[PDB]
Amino acid sequence: SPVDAVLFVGMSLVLGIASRHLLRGTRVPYTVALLVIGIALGSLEYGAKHNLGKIGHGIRIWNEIDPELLLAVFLPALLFESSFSMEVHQIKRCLGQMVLLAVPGVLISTACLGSLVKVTFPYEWDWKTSLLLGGLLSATDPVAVVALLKELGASKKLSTIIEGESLMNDGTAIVVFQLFLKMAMGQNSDWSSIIKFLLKVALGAVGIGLAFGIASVIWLKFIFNDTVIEITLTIAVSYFAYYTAQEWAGASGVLTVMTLGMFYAAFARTAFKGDSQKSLHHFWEMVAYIANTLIFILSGVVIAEGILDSDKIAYQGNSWRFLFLLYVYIQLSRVVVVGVLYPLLCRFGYGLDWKESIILVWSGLRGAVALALSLSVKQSSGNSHISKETGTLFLFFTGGIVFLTLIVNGSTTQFVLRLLRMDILPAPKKRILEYTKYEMLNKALRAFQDLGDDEELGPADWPTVESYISSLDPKSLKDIRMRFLNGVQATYWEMLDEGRISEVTANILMQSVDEALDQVSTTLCDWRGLKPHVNFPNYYNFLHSKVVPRKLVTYFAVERLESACYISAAFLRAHTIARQQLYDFLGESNIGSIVINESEKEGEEAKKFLEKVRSSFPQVLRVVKTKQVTYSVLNHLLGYIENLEKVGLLEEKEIAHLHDAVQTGLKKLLRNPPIVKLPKLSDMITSHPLSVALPPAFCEPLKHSKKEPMKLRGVTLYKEGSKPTGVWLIFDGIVKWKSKILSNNHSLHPTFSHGSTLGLYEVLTGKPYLCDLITDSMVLCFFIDSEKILSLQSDSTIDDFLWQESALVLLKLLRPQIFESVAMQELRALVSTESSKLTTYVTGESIEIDCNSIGLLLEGFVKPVGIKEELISSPAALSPSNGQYIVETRARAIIFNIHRGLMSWPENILSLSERAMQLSIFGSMVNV
Amino acid sequence: SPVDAVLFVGMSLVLGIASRHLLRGTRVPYTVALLVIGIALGSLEYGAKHNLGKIGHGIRIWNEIDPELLLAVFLPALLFESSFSMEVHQIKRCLGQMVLLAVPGVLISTACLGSLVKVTFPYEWDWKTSLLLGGLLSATDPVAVVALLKELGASKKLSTIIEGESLMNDGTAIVVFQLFLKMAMGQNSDWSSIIKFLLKVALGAVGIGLAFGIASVIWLKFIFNDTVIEITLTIAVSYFAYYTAQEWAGASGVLTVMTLGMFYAAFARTAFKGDSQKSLHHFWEMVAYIANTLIFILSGVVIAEGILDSDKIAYQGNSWRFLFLLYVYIQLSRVVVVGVLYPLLCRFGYGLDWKESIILVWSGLRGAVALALSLSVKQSSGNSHISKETGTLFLFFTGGIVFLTLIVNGSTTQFVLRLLRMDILPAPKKRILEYTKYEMLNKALRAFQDLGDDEELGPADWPTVESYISSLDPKSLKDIRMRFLNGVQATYWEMLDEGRISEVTANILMQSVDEALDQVSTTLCDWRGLKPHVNFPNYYNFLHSKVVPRKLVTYFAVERLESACYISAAFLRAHTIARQQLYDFLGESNIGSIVINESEKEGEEAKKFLEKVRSSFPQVLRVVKTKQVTYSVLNHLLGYIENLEKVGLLEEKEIAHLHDAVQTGLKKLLRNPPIVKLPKLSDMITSHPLSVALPPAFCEPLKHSKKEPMKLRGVTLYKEGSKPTGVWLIFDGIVKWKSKILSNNHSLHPTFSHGSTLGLYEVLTGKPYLCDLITDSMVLCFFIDSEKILSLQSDSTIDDFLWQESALVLLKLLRPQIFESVAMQELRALVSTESSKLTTYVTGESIEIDCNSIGLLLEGFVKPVGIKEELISSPAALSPSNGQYIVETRARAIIFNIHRGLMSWPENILSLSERAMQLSIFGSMVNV
């Protein structure tokens, strides 16, 4: 007999596999087909008394399945992954509406449904059992709703809203179902009894789940490099959570497993390995899928057994009337609960409209959970409390509700989508889709360009490759804003590809910009999407209560402000790059200036947040940047190691050691944020690039003490035209430069970065201060007198290096049209190149600027050739006027050699030789 | 009571997880720790009579586990993935030694061990039960051996040899164990009875497994895009294979599941999805891991129960003597079987030496399979045939053998490795390792270069990042050969990265070159590694037996020659590129010429194989190239789609549709090779680049009939100095050009490719044929008379295009020093660039060649300036002599603008500004 049960399980599994395979994108889920097949099989086994053999034995051995055993085997398996694959950031974005739809939504739904099925539902029912029915089919199938919504059209709001509300409705409905099913078996008599029972079954289960989750997350953080033990540990901890919950504490094990899934979705994304997460999700999806198909087949067969029993419930000819009435009651209950919650749903979280309201009310899919609970009721029934017809009627009613609710509410929802103007794709997103379907074509064409150079295998055939990929202004403010926001999206994509931010941060930023793209007509609301993720409420940690450890403060501050810090940094860099790109694209359009000013003013509270973080926690910024840098570095190393393992180029021991080392580094990162000692002033002096010219004797004036590096926001450094009293050093912070005399035109983002010396040009030339410096953020800055640098000017090499640094700063100043749109990173390479040479020019000589090169005069006067004689002053930024410049005074100079298509997609894209190219590579005629 | 069993399962699982986590790289497997813990728990439950509570109930409910149930639950779970993760190409490389070690190796081991444990092993035993013991602990644990060997030092031979021999020893041992355990329960009496029983249990099980594998592979090929249903289908088909095998046909279900795993490892790599394979492997590893830990714990607890029973077997004080004798017998049996098989092992497959012999004999690890079979014996025992002590003694003996065999043979094997000079890493592989640990450093440094440009988060801290990555000639023939082979490895790596070949082909080529690197002293044996994978035995298909379908011939030919065709193509391209790179690296070394000649002569039988394929099947080459091209294109598109899904940049419906389309294309590819119609001559004419100049009236001389395009190998095209009788067209094939008059120096690989016109220069200039053409392979070539082209010369645009193509060919001829090391792909871009212009020069004018540009004279005479007056003839290839050329006759010309470090790793790798750079980016002092 045990072999019969496993044979039934395997047969049901094969039927599930077949039904899912045949019914992909057929506007009908495989689950309803499984239910119908199970009903047919049960009818053939019981209704017709046809001896099915061993399959019949399996049917009759699973017909007597214990209720509690059914819950234990199935319900946690259904609910673990449904609560595991959550995008917890989106949930925390709209958690208020989630709980509002979950707890009081289910309460109201159960109350209304029980009242309706008690007043007019003639079977001489009881109020407790009717409310039990309400709480039974007040549960929404999460996986079916997720699949429907992915097939359905919902940008990001309805998807997560309905997903989470169904997920939490499962738990709330199972809790209320347990409460109502436990009617008067020696307990649950008075109001205090049910209150304490709820307290236990809910809070104790949640606490057990959270404790087990914490223990397992610590274990995972302590597990360095192994995929399999992670899935196995998840299985073991889930089983022990269920065991402790229901056989040690008496709580609800299913709710404990569901809370465990919540905790793993929330605080265990970084605990799991980078490559093990996909496999773990696939395996738990597989467990949930087997559980779902098996519970559906079992429900179908038990319904068929029940409705065609000796009493012949189905052949009464009247039960279907009340089944249709119950479906109407489901619809009415959903309508009334959505209407009641609408006055509060709209004011919290995501804005909900009547369109979203009707999509929400119509997208109620009672599936596996309701069927499992109904099977639980139609088992161990027939006693004094729950009778026998009073049992099947529940099972047949719930099965018919699942049938109708998955056929009509699963099919006609798309037809409703066709109305109400939601299936239409907005132009801001249509541009994105058509661009991404245009990069597919270009990437494929470049690949076919590359795979045509070889000659041993002969030409390729373009038509088949094309067949296999056959699935392929300036005066308008809104278009300019949309182009700017698309540029911001491209910048986020590029910075994620290069590795500024992890996957979750990029997802948050892209979701926010997608939300902001819908309000392109009005002011840019990009930062409004990021507002929930950037919070700096209080700093009670600095009230001396916890600064005594002076190390846990850094840990807590990082763990709380870490994601917000990446979000703000990426936001600022994206808007800077996008502003520069838009300025290049438009040049001098007034609309361009308006939108740039709009973006600059809009991205101000993020700067305020970063300034507050810097002023409160000076060391959190360095730790956060270190964590980001090492995370990106380790991801690159992991990619290289995966490539090597694919090749097999190294032995399976050295490559295993390297992979283990990289995984250990990643786990030590995601476990504890990097510990960086607070740098002293001398450490920053040594780390500063200018310290090479600074002798070690000058490196220890009591290790450069007696001065505090910090400078508050807005503190001036030196006024324009003032005497060069000294030169500053910028170890960390922001300095803004302004000057009317200098050609500050097209200087969109005037800013010097860390590791720079400022004012060196004036102190080594004696000229008045060219630029006015204002510190936009708190800057860790140091001052060194003019006399020290003038003394350092004694030797030739030090003087040459000092004038090289002066030249770099003077390129940053004089020519922001080209060199402002680049960090101080590459300019050091340009100045350090041996081709770039410092030269001294005598009167009568000239400057040999030519093609593919640029020049810079530092001191002296130059006479141009071919133009009216001009006395070009010391800061010149000499450039080839044609694609000359004789010297007239004592002069010394220096010479140098000199995804981003989404902003302008349709505005950034024949000769007899081109056609020859096209034929020699492609087929007859296909544009490249 | 059922809850007790599941509690025991969960406790054992947690203990397994803990033991594996603690004992990673401790030179002791977690399995022995699990065995010891199980023995201790059983001793505490039975030996001390200490009431353990519910854990004790679980122990006593699993103590009475049914034997057949134990096999069913455990053994297929152990063996499915052990037979699933095979690298089947390496197995087919050395299958002869595999079967030799498996079938007769196990037979000899069982015979010798049974004889030894029957002659001197006093318990009044029987011969059948003693041979049963031999066949029981004649099984080697596959997973433990794999883990040990990955920790152990074996390049590629011992690893796969021992892995496969243990894997097949499992099946052979379970078959012989079933045969010996089935002694005289109403069957297996005479020799005919055992012969037919073996025939059934082996061949019928293999056939059932193969049929189920074929059905499931067809199902997988018909499944387009879904990960979960693939794992679920694997589970379902495995269960149904076991069911059909043992409860419908009477065969051995475990052997059927093992053969199913073989079939999936062999012919189902392409059936599974590209992203689902890793998850599926992880899940089945997880199932095998739970099965292994549970069987180990169960074996330990049952041993503890048995040896401390009423009879007190352990406390007899003598059983350990015979246990140690049995361990010595295991060692002696392994020694004798390896010695017997050595005269035949060495002559077949991989060469096996005494060093490999001792590593093989010492690496025998009896693990989970032997313990499971021994538990099967110590259950349903105590009857007339198998007694009761005669049962435990088997269980305690097998458990002690596993204990000793996993402690000493699992630890001292590394110490033996320390001797015999195998742990030493050879210099050819040490160079590879130190290079790959040098690209880690460069990639990390470049990443830190990129992640230092931003300014909102401030500087990064280099020391912590460094801490997290703290795990980091010309006259010698052998060094030159090693450098050349490293260049070939780099070429394979680059061509896999760009996508010439799949992962398996790149793995085969890299394994072959790794094997060849060990014989660097002698002639290059690279092709010897590829020899088993390149076979063209017979072409009976062309005997008119199966050419009537004239479509199944292409299918069968592709399916048989497909991998060999990629291997040969990649081999040829890799050696061409490596020869060119080596010639660039050395220039004119005699050793370089010797090794280049060696490589060219060595890579000749691959050309012969490709020529045979082309002559037999003309259309297989195009189909194979098409399949490769579309596979690479779809992989690139899948990578882009995965990037987009990570971003979340598109809605979850359009991106889902694109992913589904790409997966459907990939499945339609891997299911059926692409169907390409055989191109007609007119199709190739139109597809040829020169057809643009050919008018449509000239495009249909009865669609260019009356001529057969094919030309055999070695057929000349036109002799040097002959009159330009016409111009040829190369649609597909190889042409070699030789000319003493032309500067053929440094022309390492003189070859024109497909889609080219040859001889056009001479026919449009009237000069004698510059080059001598020899067809190195069968070429599909066409001839067009001189009069037609001279007539086409009538119009200006056609003449300009014709002279542009002439210029491209003449760059391919005159300057092979620069333009031979590039395909005809990019040269079309160079000639087609608008900067590259065709100009007509009158006598007295000059050619304006300058920096960053090149020139070409086609007809006329030119006088140089600054050098003795030379009459440079019509083919000139004018180049800037300094980094001039006045015209003297009627002349017309044309102007143009103009992983690979592994070959030379240690010979391809400060100023005051450089130190400033280093400080401004990094910490104090770290070389870049």
Numbering used by the authors:
A (entry chain A), B (entry chain B): 32 to 503, 524 to 934, 958 to 972, 1007 to 1017, 1030 to 1048
What does the primary publication say about this deposited structure?
However, superimposition of SOS1-ClassIV structure to the SOS1-ClassII structure gives rise to RMSDs of 1.5 Å for overall structure, indicating that two different SOS1 structures have been resolved. The structural comparison indicates that the dimerized SOS1-ClassIV harbors a distinct conformation to the 2.8-Å resolution SOS1 that the TMD undergoes significant conformational changes and the intracellular domains are nearly identical, supported by the RMSD values between these two structures are 2.0 Å and 0.7 Å for TMD and CTD, respectively. Taking a close look, the extracellular ends of TM helices from two protomers expand in opposing directions, except that the TM8 and TM9 remain unaltered, while the cytoplasmic ends of TM helices are superimposable. Therefore, we termed the SOS1-ClassIV structure as SOS1expand. Within the hydrophobic central cavity between dimerization domains, we found that the lipid molecules differently interact with the SOS1 in these two conformations. In both structures, four lipid molecules are determined at similar positions proximal to the 2-fold symmetrical axis. However, in the SOS1expand structure, an extra lipid is inserted into space between TM1 and TM3′ helices at the dimerization interface. Meanwhile, the side chain of Y270 on TM8′ is extruded in the SOS1expand structure to accommodate this lipid molecule. In the SOS1expand structure, two extra lipids were determined to be buried in the dimerization interface, leading to extracellular expansion of the TMD. However, the differences in bound lipids did not result in significant conformational changes in the intracellular ends of TM helices and in the intracellular domains.
Salt-overly-sensitive 1 (SOS1) is a unique electroneutral Na+/H+ antiporter at the plasma membrane of higher plants and plays a central role in resisting salt stress. SOS1, which is highly conserved in the phylae of the plant kingdom, is identified as the only Na+/H+ transporter that localizes at the plasma membrane and specifically exports Na+ by utilizing the electrochemical proton gradient generated by H+-ATPase6,7. SOS1 forms a homodimer and is composed of a TMD and an intracellular domain. Previous studies have shown that the C-terminus of SOS1 contains an autoinhibitory domain to keep the transporter in a resting state with basal activity.
